[PDB]
Amino acid sequence: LKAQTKTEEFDAIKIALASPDMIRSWSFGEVKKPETINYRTFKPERDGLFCARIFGPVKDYECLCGKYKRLKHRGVICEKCGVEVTQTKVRRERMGHIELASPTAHIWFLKSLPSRIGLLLDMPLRDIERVLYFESYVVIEGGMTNLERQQILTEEQYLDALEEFGDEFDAKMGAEAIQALLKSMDLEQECEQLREELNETNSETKRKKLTKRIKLLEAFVQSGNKPEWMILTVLPVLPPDLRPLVPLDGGRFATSDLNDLYRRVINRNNRLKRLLDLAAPDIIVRNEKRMLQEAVDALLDNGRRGRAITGSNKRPLKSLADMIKGGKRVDYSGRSVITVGPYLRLHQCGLPKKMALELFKPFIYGKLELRGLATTIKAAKKMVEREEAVVWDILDEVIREHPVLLNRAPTLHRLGIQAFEPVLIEGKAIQLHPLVCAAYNADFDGDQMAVHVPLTLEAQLEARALMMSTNNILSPANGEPIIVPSQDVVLGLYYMTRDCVNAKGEGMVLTGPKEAERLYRSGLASLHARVKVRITEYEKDANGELVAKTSLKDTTVGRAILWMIVPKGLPYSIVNQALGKKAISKMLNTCYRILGLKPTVIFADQIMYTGFAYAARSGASVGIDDMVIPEKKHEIISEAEAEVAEIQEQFQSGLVTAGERYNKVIDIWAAANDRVSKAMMDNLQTETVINRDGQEEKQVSFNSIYMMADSGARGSAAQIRQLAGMRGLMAKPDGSIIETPITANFREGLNVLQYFISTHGARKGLADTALKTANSGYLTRRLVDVAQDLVVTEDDCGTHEGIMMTPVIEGGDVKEPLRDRVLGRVTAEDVLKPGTADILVPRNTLLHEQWCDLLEENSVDAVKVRSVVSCDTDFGVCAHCYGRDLARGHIINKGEAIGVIAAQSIGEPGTQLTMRDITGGLPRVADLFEARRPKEPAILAEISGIVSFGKETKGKRRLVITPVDGSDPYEEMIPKWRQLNVFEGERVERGDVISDGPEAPHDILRLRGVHAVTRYIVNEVQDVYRLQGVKINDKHIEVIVRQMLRKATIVNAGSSDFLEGEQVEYSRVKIANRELEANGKVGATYSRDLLGITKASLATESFISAASFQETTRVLTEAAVAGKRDELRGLKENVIVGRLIPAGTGYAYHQDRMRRRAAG
Amino acid sequence: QSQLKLLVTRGKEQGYLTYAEVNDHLPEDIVDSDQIEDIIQMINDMGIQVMEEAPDADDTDPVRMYMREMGTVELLTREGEIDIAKRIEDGINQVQCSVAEYPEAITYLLEQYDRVEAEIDPELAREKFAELRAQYVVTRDTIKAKGRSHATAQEEILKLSEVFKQFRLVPKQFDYLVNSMRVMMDRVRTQERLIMKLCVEQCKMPKKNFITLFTGNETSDTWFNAAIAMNKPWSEKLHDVSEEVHRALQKLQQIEEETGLTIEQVKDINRRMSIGEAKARRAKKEMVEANLRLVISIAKKYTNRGLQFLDLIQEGNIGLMKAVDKFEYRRGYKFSTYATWWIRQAITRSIADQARTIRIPVHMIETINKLNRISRQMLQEMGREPTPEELAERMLMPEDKIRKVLKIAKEPISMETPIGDDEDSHLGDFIEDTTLELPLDSATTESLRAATHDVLAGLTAREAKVLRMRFGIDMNTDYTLEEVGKQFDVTRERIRQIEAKALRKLRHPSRSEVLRS
Ligand SMILES: [Mg+2]
Ligand SMILES: [Zn+2]
């Protein structure tokens, strides 16, 4: 016995046509005058666009005239002027209407791609439907003689037919004529007779229009909307506050264009009303009616036909539709220039004093009034406005464990916004931890970040348990660590290794920590010698715990002292015995996988501190003598120019092909470039001589530059090769290469010519960067738009099938193995063992248990693994079938947000993708995801049969192959162009290659298989990331491909109507509920269909979600026609409405409310 | 064929959606802003099938379509115009004569005149109305006397009609009379259609028999009882409607007594009146339809001034529609110029008001235009810009009046105006809201309520209530010293004493002190 009539919680929103009476329901009065505000009193006119009696009062609680002022009469209307004295926000929510004389056609339901009023009526849009309502050619409204039912007549034909019969087939013209047409139309009887006629002896020569319209008519009739509402007779009015005319600075009002529109339509409508009472000349009245049509259409949606101008502005007027067709500012926020903060931890950030003071204003107020100090709220305001010492301490209390989340401009992935504990800093710049300085892709060139203050309690906990930096150790894209130490610190730890012979060395042994005392007290060096010490190692096995292991290993001073930082566990020493390069991150990774979060975090802070400190102690610099040039430079250059000289002489005397000597001489200079490069590196690498004991030995150069290169720290081979070696082949604006490479280098002088040559490379480099940077996000938007609705649900379903994972082997003819693509993956079922037993069924491949997949030798290189591609889930993703790859080490928590994180991880490295039988680059990625047919698609054998020619060029034609065997034939079409690969008589299998060219994903999915096409997409999209050298897990690719294969096509006979291509969601859930419902014969078999990202994203349940990205004027219209309703499970549509997101911290709420909406 | 084959074969799929291609491969008049959206809608989105939805749908302008129907010239000459005007006067005359036939129109005019005299020469009114009343009272006697069997009596009736035709009535009066007669006729046919609906359908009496019977007297029961006593199968059903038909006849006879006219002729005079109306209306319509050119031609000069071309020519059409009404062919003046003035006045009395969003009076518009016309010379007859003081000096108005005048000019500016050209800026986006209060301010107000609600606690009832009721807080309507002095016996000074004593109490607490500021 509920049935509440108030503004409570809603479970869904409904969209449909509006009856004239439906408009009257919103009407709080009727606009009747084009008047807005008074010319002198500046007061709302009587019945104008800004009435007070109709809409709302100007001032809050005082009426128009002034008979009533204060809260005494908040429910009673005024005597002199019926002005309901409530609020002024009432003026913002009140509707109102205008009631037109002659009917008017709604511009949307009239001319919006398909003519809704036309297709519903079966009548040409801009041809007939225009000429019959623009007062030109009269139309018929049903005749029982000579004339049909919807034919078009001229005035002459009208009077002729009227004379022949008349007074029994009367049919007007114009708007009301189309009204009587739609009104007379019987949706029910037509829905029957159309079904009858459009099924009688007709092949595929008609079925198109038949199925189309019948589905459309059935939809409209079942929608509930009456076709009468299509053209309106009562036009509603927008609230005044949503289109106000507010006085700016010193007069000069500011109004909305809608006021001009409504004023025009009101004027034209009034004249029409007046003409329908005075003398009524047909030309005059009909013209004014067409003008009313103009005004109404211009108000609803300009678009579209010339665009009504006026308003002095040469620009058009922003109609209603243009205000809803196509960035959320927020309080408690700020931004500033960022700065490095070495003394910070990983969970801390430097927040400026004055900045944090203004940010936590309301918190300071509350805490002040709570303790004492400030007698009242305004006292607190005055107390903080006059920064009075004690207030700062109170601030030190409010920001204590109150997380503040930071954000950078280009937010590519989840790690764009990370939370920190605010640390007050005497300054006006925002300091950041140098470890998470890579996740933001932030530099200190002058980049500036923004800060947000989690106000809500659960918002603070969300920031601490999710967005906190300490929880984001690993990258969501690849399992590898993301807060890994960078340039400065890594060069430091690289210097803390680097075993140098002798030089204050000798093997004076001690025990770990004591070595520190040895280092500070000089005497001994630091990079010697090697030297031996006692290392107390710790290891665990089987029953965990800890097992000591004291020994005597030969490390160095640096390794000895550095060992102190290493946590309890770990293999110890051997992780330090190496150096500082990539194992610097490997060490962090292993530490995380064998210890945990906290030990890894503190280890990260320690290694950062260590790196910085010892790097500072080192004092590595970059003098001009650090980049030593090879002596053989001029030699190699002369030799190369000698060879090219001979080639040019040969070209002079004919001999060699002069047409392509350009290429081979380029090979000469290219070889020479590699010669200079190899010479420079082999020199600058080792060098040195030292003098160990009895002198004479060789190590590796301590040449600063090399130290930077052999330890990450921004220093690559190519860059160094340009510094001391030579800048190789340079590009030319033509796209060609110049046959005179930059012989000189930056260490040397650079001639004006070759610099004017290199300027092209720099120009196109920056330009191309500017393109791919925006193009990357341009792809990301499509990825998110298509994927941001699926979330891991229903815990862990059954099913065992899944793509057989195998090491990506180009080693067929080039040798290149990668076998780490299986880890944190849930096993399909006991994937065998050269003997028996071993692997369990649903056992997720651990990080230590994937290392067990090496104890089964190189024999086992194939494992079946559950993936998101398969998974017999319905509207989500099985937790098992997904994996675990997060910043978290465990499996994904039930109700995460796989879609967005997948899209982000894919489109994040897009910044470093070079756009162009190998396209390659971001464009290649786009084409693979869009699933576009190649420029020269190959062909496959649909059914295994016997290959034979089917009439040599007898069409038409063009060759024909016919693989026939067992039963029934097939006739494929070969267009002569491009050869073949299978002679006549030979047999083929189900999906064999008979064109040896580019494969089409549609054909692969349609014939080869889903596992094959998904394997193709992932292994082809990865191959373009291999070249760019960007690590990205296959899980996410499989994730987007999952809903990339969302819909299918049914071919048989079931409750679903055959030709309709529907998603396997409704398909599977309905076929599961039909085998055991009444009969399996009341349902058909479906067929998976490959559709691109855009084509897939285009289709979606919610009309609001669609109204977001795709064309709003279309989606909103068509969704209006059929009584559709969003209810209401998507992310995006649940975001713009401003409620809890059906994922993460939500989900539980949605599940409860979802089950709650089962009672009715 | 052409459009379909070219579009389909070319767009496969034109790669980058090459719009600037096939739009030239289309017929008709180009450079439209209409056909554009019909191509950007088909190419992408609903691919493949949409390209099949395009042709099947493929298998314009207000003014250009207005000149079209206006193209039907049917122009006139002095002979034509005078002809049409003659038909107008003929129709009007027949209508007025038909009104003269109506005696109740005369007697009503007489009654309302006595109303006028019971509260334009007053004696002249007492003169003509006396003439009318005289001819009426002499014609009225020649009715029941029946002397001269409506032959010479008819002469006095028609003479009375002529006397009535001497009166030049007001439009409201004539319309009221005519409408009254048509409403009377509405009741007449109401009763007639009642009798017919009852006797023909409910009693199963053929329409042939009803027209043969009823058409006679139409009032006396002589036809009804003769229809019942006809002993027909449909005569026995008449008994079930005898009271209804009787009631209708009695009411129709009542109408006979109301109009004092023969019921078998009221249809005749009302008929001829209708004939006159349709004729005059028709002729006047032909007139306005003919001089349609003049409207647009003179409206062209008023273009571009806060109102579009169609609106202007429309006000010109109604201006012409008014000009035709007040005009006679028996006039040396032609229609070409007389109509021109009415049209100019019609549209100029429209551009004056319904142009800008804000209201404005005619005198304001004229003063503004005059100011502009004067200002355009001061900068051209000198060399420097026209100073506001000197510009005001060359006019009757002081200066500040002109200052306030310029604060009414312009639409003015619209919010949707681009400003900084950001991504993307809008003037209406910089407009701040001021009707709202700061959340800080609202919080301080709430804390203020609590503060006062806690301060009046440290008081006595005969002091808290005093301060509360006097300054009116937590009780809406505030009272004065008397209304509080009466409910507390001791009047005025006593209650003011306590009222001051409470204020004395508030000189140590700091809460309200800091809340002051
Ligand atoms: Mg930068
Ligand atoms: Zn009032």
Ligand SMILES: [Zn+2]
């Ligand atoms: Zn699953």
